[PDB]
PDB file of C-alpha atoms (C1' of nucleotides) in Angstrom:
ATOM      1  CA  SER A   1      -0.532 -27.559   5.637  1.00 44.70           C
ATOM      2  CA  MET A   2      -3.329 -28.708   4.416  1.00 43.08           C
ATOM      3  CA  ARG A   3      -5.327 -27.503   1.961  1.00 40.31           C
ATOM      4  CA  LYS A   4      -8.403 -29.086   3.981  1.00 37.95           C
ATOM      5  CA  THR A   5      -7.985 -27.245   6.849  1.00 37.31           C
ATOM      6  CA  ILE A   6      -6.779 -24.271   5.546  1.00 34.05           C
ATOM      7  CA  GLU A   7      -9.793 -24.418   3.358  1.00 35.89           C
ATOM      8  CA  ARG A   8     -12.471 -24.823   6.884  1.00 33.65           C
ATOM      9  CA  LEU A   9     -10.028 -21.539   8.597  1.00 33.97           C
ATOM     10  CA  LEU A  10     -10.920 -19.289   4.885  1.00 37.16           C
ATOM     11  CA  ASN A  11     -15.309 -20.875   5.314  1.00 40.21           C
ATOM     12  CA  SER A  12     -15.148 -20.224   9.323  1.00 38.66           C
ATOM     13  CA  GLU A  13     -18.239 -17.329  10.013  1.00 38.25           C
ATOM     14  CA  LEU A  14     -15.200 -16.052  12.372  1.00 38.58           C
ATOM     15  CA  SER A  15     -13.701 -12.928  11.473  1.00 35.83           C
ATOM     16  CA  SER A  16     -11.396 -12.347   8.913  1.00 36.13           C
ATOM     17  CA  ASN A  17      -9.726 -10.014  11.534  1.00 36.74           C
ATOM     18  CA  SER A  18     -10.267 -11.707  14.585  1.00 36.80           C
ATOM     19  CA  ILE A  19      -8.496 -15.135  12.482  1.00 35.26           C
ATOM     20  CA  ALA A  20      -6.031 -12.440  11.464  1.00 34.80           C
ATOM     21  CA  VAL A  21      -5.063 -11.409  14.431  1.00 32.60           C
ATOM     22  CA  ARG A  22      -4.575 -14.615  16.277  1.00 31.60           C
ATOM     23  CA  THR A  23      -2.986 -16.370  13.515  1.00 28.31           C
ATOM     24  CA  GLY A  24      -0.920 -12.966  12.908  1.00 33.96           C
ATOM     25  CA  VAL A  25      -1.232 -13.220   9.078  1.00 33.36           C
ATOM     26  CA  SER A  26      -2.532 -10.126   7.367  1.00 35.68           C
ATOM     27  CA  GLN A  27      -6.197  -9.125   7.389  1.00 37.07           C
ATOM     28  CA  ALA A  28      -5.263  -7.840   4.085  1.00 33.34           C
ATOM     29  CA  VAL A  29      -4.326 -11.125   2.795  1.00 35.67           C
ATOM     30  CA  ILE A  30      -7.258 -13.675   4.845  1.00 32.77           C
ATOM     31  CA  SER A  31      -9.788 -11.004   2.747  1.00 31.20           C
ATOM     32  CA  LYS A  32      -8.130 -11.590  -0.314  1.00 30.67           C
ATOM     33  CA  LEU A  33      -7.939 -15.538  -0.167  1.00 31.66           C
ATOM     34  CA  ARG A  34     -11.122 -15.619   1.017  1.00 31.12           C
ATOM     35  CA  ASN A  35     -12.791 -12.785  -2.039  1.00 27.73           C
ATOM     36  CA  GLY A  36     -10.300 -14.509  -4.041  1.00 26.46           C
ATOM     37  CA  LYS A  37      -7.799 -12.288  -5.343  1.00 25.06           C
ATOM     38  CA  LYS A  38      -5.008 -14.507  -4.091  1.00 26.13           C
ATOM     39  CA  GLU A  39      -3.814 -18.555  -3.777  1.00 29.00           C
ATOM     40  CA  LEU A  40      -4.165 -20.636  -1.086  1.00 28.53           C
ATOM     41  CA  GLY A  41      -1.496 -21.860  -3.879  1.00 26.47           C
ATOM     42  CA  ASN A  42       0.687 -18.592  -4.083  1.00 26.74           C
ATOM     43  CA  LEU A  43       1.140 -18.621   0.237  1.00 26.16           C
ATOM     44  CA  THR A  44       4.431 -18.575   1.869  1.00 23.95           C
ATOM     45  CA  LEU A  45       4.528 -22.327   3.715  1.00 23.98           C
ATOM     46  CA  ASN A  46       5.701 -20.106   7.221  1.00 22.53           C
ATOM     47  CA  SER A  47       2.216 -18.018   6.607  1.00 21.96           C
ATOM     48  CA  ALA A  48       0.004 -21.965   5.903  1.00 21.47           C
ATOM     49  CA  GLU A  49       1.768 -23.275   8.597  1.00 22.54           C
ATOM     50  CA  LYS A  50       0.333 -20.087  10.823  1.00 27.44           C
ATOM     51  CA  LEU A  51      -3.622 -21.135   9.777  1.00 28.39           C
ATOM     52  CA  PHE A  52      -3.561 -24.665   9.855  1.00 26.28           C
ATOM     53  CA  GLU A  53      -2.161 -24.290  13.017  1.00 26.60           C
ATOM     54  CA  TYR A  54      -5.360 -21.981  14.648  1.00 27.09           C
ATOM     55  CA  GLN A  55      -7.558 -24.353  12.835  1.00 25.75           C
ATOM     56  CA  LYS A  56      -6.188 -27.268  14.896  1.00 25.13           C
ATOM     57  CA  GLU A  57      -6.204 -25.979  17.819  1.00 24.57           C
ATOM     58  CA  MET A  58      -9.515 -25.250  17.547  1.00 24.57           C
ATOM     59  CA  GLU A  59     -10.852 -28.263  15.544  1.00 27.11           C
ATOM     60  CA  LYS A  60      -9.620 -30.884  18.545  1.00 26.54           C
ATOM     61  CA  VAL A  61     -11.699 -28.732  21.543  1.00 30.16           C
TER      62      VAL A  61
ATOM     63  CA  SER B   1       2.802 -30.506   3.392  1.00 30.14           C
ATOM     64  CA  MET B   2       4.865 -30.604   6.640  1.00 31.08           C
ATOM     65  CA  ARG B   3       7.999 -28.928   6.942  1.00 33.05           C
ATOM     66  CA  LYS B   4       9.076 -31.806   8.651  1.00 33.73           C
ATOM     67  CA  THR B   5       8.150 -33.841   5.960  1.00 32.78           C
ATOM     68  CA  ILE B   6      10.068 -31.373   3.479  1.00 31.92           C
ATOM     69  CA  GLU B   7      13.095 -31.979   4.807  1.00 30.53           C
ATOM     70  CA  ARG B   8      13.572 -34.938   5.320  1.00 28.53           C
ATOM     71  CA  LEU B   9      13.246 -34.930   1.597  1.00 26.94           C
ATOM     72  CA  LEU B  10      16.132 -32.317   1.045  1.00 27.87           C
ATOM     73  CA  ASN B  11      18.017 -34.084   3.941  1.00 29.81           C
ATOM     74  CA  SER B  12      17.575 -37.162   1.327  1.00 28.46           C
ATOM     75  CA  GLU B  13      20.316 -38.875  -0.097  1.00 27.46           C
ATOM     76  CA  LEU B  14      18.084 -37.857  -4.062  1.00 28.54           C
ATOM     77  CA  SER B  15      19.798 -36.351  -6.584  1.00 28.35           C
ATOM     78  CA  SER B  16      18.574 -32.597  -6.721  1.00 30.82           C
ATOM     79  CA  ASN B  17      17.771 -32.830 -10.635  1.00 27.63           C
ATOM     80  CA  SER B  18      16.160 -36.620  -9.875  1.00 28.92           C
ATOM     81  CA  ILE B  19      13.357 -34.927  -7.391  1.00 26.35           C
ATOM     82  CA  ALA B  20      12.735 -32.640 -10.151  1.00 28.11           C
ATOM     83  CA  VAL B  21      11.869 -34.587 -12.326  1.00 26.68           C
ATOM     84  CA  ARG B  22       9.515 -36.723 -10.108  1.00 27.70           C
ATOM     85  CA  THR B  23       7.783 -33.211  -8.622  1.00 32.04           C
ATOM     86  CA  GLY B  24       6.974 -31.644 -11.362  1.00 32.63           C
ATOM     87  CA  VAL B  25      10.165 -28.913  -8.880  1.00 32.69           C
ATOM     88  CA  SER B  26      12.490 -27.296 -10.378  1.00 31.68           C
ATOM     89  CA  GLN B  27      16.169 -28.620  -9.762  1.00 29.63           C
ATOM     90  CA  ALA B  28      16.693 -24.942  -9.283  1.00 27.12           C
ATOM     91  CA  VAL B  29      14.625 -24.642  -6.265  1.00 26.78           C
ATOM     92  CA  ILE B  30      15.364 -27.959  -4.644  1.00 28.30           C
ATOM     93  CA  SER B  31      18.973 -27.287  -5.354  1.00 24.96           C
ATOM     94  CA  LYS B  32      18.687 -23.074  -3.435  1.00 22.88           C
ATOM     95  CA  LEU B  33      16.611 -24.912  -0.465  1.00 21.75           C
ATOM     96  CA  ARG B  34      19.647 -28.098  -0.233  1.00 22.51           C
ATOM     97  CA  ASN B  35      21.757 -24.996  -0.212  1.00 21.50           C
ATOM     98  CA  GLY B  36      20.589 -22.475   1.984  1.00 19.39           C
ATOM     99  CA  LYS B  37      20.297 -19.555  -0.767  1.00 19.60           C
ATOM    100  CA  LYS B  38      16.211 -20.363  -0.201  1.00 17.83           C
ATOM    101  CA  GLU B  39      13.998 -20.850   3.837  1.00 16.41           C
ATOM    102  CA  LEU B  40      11.706 -23.502   2.999  1.00 14.17           C
ATOM    103  CA  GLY B  41       8.592 -21.332   4.792  1.00  9.15           C
ATOM    104  CA  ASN B  42       9.338 -18.577   1.735  1.00  8.05           C
ATOM    105  CA  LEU B  43       8.009 -21.879  -0.647  1.00  6.60           C
ATOM    106  CA  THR B  44       4.546 -21.530  -1.959  1.00 10.86           C
ATOM    107  CA  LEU B  45       2.665 -24.293  -1.414  1.00 14.99           C
ATOM    108  CA  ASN B  46       1.089 -25.883  -4.598  1.00 13.29           C
ATOM    109  CA  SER B  47       4.866 -26.633  -4.642  1.00 11.66           C
ATOM    110  CA  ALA B  48       5.583 -27.886  -1.056  1.00 11.40           C
ATOM    111  CA  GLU B  49       2.237 -30.213  -1.792  1.00 15.10           C
ATOM    112  CA  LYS B  50       4.168 -31.907  -4.854  1.00 15.60           C
ATOM    113  CA  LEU B  51       7.722 -32.378  -2.971  1.00 17.44           C
ATOM    114  CA  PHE B  52       5.283 -33.578   0.043  1.00 17.61           C
ATOM    115  CA  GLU B  53       3.214 -36.039  -1.968  1.00 18.14           C
ATOM    116  CA  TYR B  54       6.820 -37.674  -2.959  1.00 16.84           C
ATOM    117  CA  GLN B  55       8.370 -37.767  -0.011  1.00 20.28           C
ATOM    118  CA  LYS B  56       4.911 -39.533   1.953  1.00 22.69           C
ATOM    119  CA  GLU B  57       5.232 -42.482  -1.375  1.00 22.90           C
ATOM    120  CA  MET B  58       8.809 -42.411  -0.140  1.00 22.90           C
ATOM    121  CA  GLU B  59       7.773 -43.389   2.813  1.00 22.96           C
ATOM    122  CA  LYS B  60       5.365 -46.403   1.882  1.00 23.47           C
ATOM    123  CA  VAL B  61       8.709 -48.299   1.609  1.00 25.84           C
ATOM    124  CA  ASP B  62      10.041 -47.808   4.151  1.00 25.20           C
TER     125      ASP B  62
ATOM    126  C1'  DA C   1     -14.739  -4.633  16.149  1.00 28.67           C
ATOM    127  C1'  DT C   2     -15.085  -5.180  11.106  1.00 30.24           C
ATOM    128  C1'  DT C   3     -14.288  -4.449   5.906  1.00 28.93           C
ATOM    129  C1'  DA C   4     -12.030  -3.812   1.235  1.00 31.63           C
ATOM    130  C1'  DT C   5      -7.748  -2.010  -1.755  1.00 37.24           C
ATOM    131  C1'  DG C   6      -3.417  -0.683  -2.559  1.00 37.80           C
ATOM    132  C1'  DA C   7       2.197   0.261  -1.884  1.00 40.06           C
ATOM    133  C1'  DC C   8       6.642  -2.111  -1.527  1.00 37.64           C
ATOM    134  C1'  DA C   9      10.661  -4.438  -0.805  1.00 35.16           C
ATOM    135  C1'  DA C  10      11.659  -8.844  -1.418  1.00 37.55           C
ATOM    136  C1'  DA C  11      10.354 -12.961  -2.423  1.00 38.20           C
ATOM    137  C1'  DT C  12       9.146 -16.512  -5.720  1.00 38.24           C
ATOM    138  C1'  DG C  13       8.121 -20.135 -10.033  1.00 35.72           C
ATOM    139  C1'  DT C  14       9.635 -21.514 -14.365  1.00 38.23           C
ATOM    140  C1'  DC C  15      12.365 -20.710 -17.568  1.00 39.91           C
ATOM    141  C1'  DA C  16      16.886 -20.689 -19.136  1.00 37.07           C
ATOM    142  C1'  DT C  17      22.524 -21.524 -18.948  1.00 38.83           C
ATOM    143  C1'  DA C  18      26.956 -22.372 -17.621  1.00 38.96           C
ATOM    144  C1'  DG C  19      29.768 -24.726 -15.493  1.00 39.90           C
TER     145       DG C  19
ATOM    146  C1'  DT D   1      24.476 -36.785 -15.911  1.00 36.19           C
ATOM    147  C1'  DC D   2      24.942 -33.097 -12.023  1.00 35.25           C
ATOM    148  C1'  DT D   3      24.783 -27.827  -9.532  1.00 34.01           C
ATOM    149  C1'  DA D   4      24.673 -23.978  -9.324  1.00 31.49           C
ATOM    150  C1'  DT D   5      23.464 -19.581 -11.142  1.00 28.75           C
ATOM    151  C1'  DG D   6      20.182 -16.023 -12.903  1.00 28.64           C
ATOM    152  C1'  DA D   7      16.479 -13.305 -15.583  1.00 25.58           C
ATOM    153  C1'  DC D   8      11.698 -12.159 -15.601  1.00 26.49           C
ATOM    154  C1'  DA D   9       6.922 -11.515 -14.646  1.00 29.13           C
ATOM    155  C1'  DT D  10       4.251 -12.239 -11.157  1.00 27.43           C
ATOM    156  C1'  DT D  11       2.909 -12.522  -6.643  1.00 27.08           C
ATOM    157  C1'  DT D  12       4.833 -12.489  -1.694  1.00 24.49           C
ATOM    158  C1'  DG D  13       4.851 -10.740   3.171  1.00 24.95           C
ATOM    159  C1'  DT D  14       4.463  -6.404   6.184  1.00 23.91           C
ATOM    160  C1'  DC D  15       2.278  -3.101   6.495  1.00 26.87           C
ATOM    161  C1'  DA D  16      -0.219   0.804   6.291  1.00 22.85           C
ATOM    162  C1'  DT D  17      -4.420   3.317   4.699  1.00 24.90           C
ATOM    163  C1'  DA D  18      -9.896   4.297   4.038  1.00 26.33           C
ATOM    164  C1'  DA D  19     -15.573   2.848   5.479  1.00 27.12           C
TER     165       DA D  19
END
DNA sequence: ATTATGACAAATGTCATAG
DNA sequence: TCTATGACATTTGTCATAA
């Protein structure tokens, strides 16, 4: 779960809900992350891996 | 913080307390992950990045 | 479709102590 | 030394809403 790649997804123009549906992570968590209420560091490795996989599968394209 | 590399440090012969001093993480969590009372998935990215950085440094020795 | 805030059960980090 | 167990304040993930 590279912090930089997850950071790219969160800073992407992709919708918070749209990222959430594909990642499987809650839109709530994505919104609170982008806005600032939650920290990426406190995220469960399981959730972090999902975000990293979604962003990497896009970078190769 | 690749799950596989952290899984490798957990499976290592290094003492739970030895890894804790070097990583800054608590012996409690490492011991509980090894015991299996704690899931690696439920760990924070902050703490896992620390255990990951340790393993990568050990990997350089090969 | 999208955006925000919660509630809640169940964890976690960071400290101990106990064996 | 080492592991094991827990306390506690805080934060999660899940599952909602309301706009």
